[PDB]
Design a protein around this ligand. Structure first.
Ligand SMILES: *[C@@H]1O[C@H](CO)[C@@H](O[C@@H]2O[C@H](CO)[C@@H](O)[C@H](O)[C@H]2NC(C)=O)[C@H](O)[C@H]1NC(C)=O
Ligand SMILES: *[C@@H]1O[C@H](CO)[C@@H](O)[C@H](O)[C@H]1NC(C)=O
Length: 49
């Protein structure tokens, strides 16, 4: 239950925008916050969250 173990833990992740791991989100209208990104590391961080 590592899903239940880390609640109430707002964490801050930084990254570098050069990779195919993170190269924003492909859409006509830009989103904001964590939802404006996509890639290997972004959906990987969504999987880990
Ligand atoms: C986040 O905070 C809430 C506050 O309600 C926690 O909920 C309680 O968590 C404890 C265990 O830490 C349980 O024993 C209680 O039954 C829960 N409810 C009550 C009555 O508060 C929640 O678990 C916390 N989440 C974390 C820290 O991961
Ligand atoms: C996590 O907790 C849930 C309770 O809803 C339980 O069903 C599940 O088996 C737990 N996960 C592990 C790996 O024990």
């Amino acid at each position: 239950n590592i899903t239940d173990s880390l609640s109430n833990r707002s964490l801050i992740v930084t990254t570098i925008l050069e990779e195919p791991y993170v190269l924003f989100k492909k859409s006509d209208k830009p989103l904001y916050g964590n939802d404006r990104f996509e890639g290997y590391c972004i959906d990987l961080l969504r999987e880990l969250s």
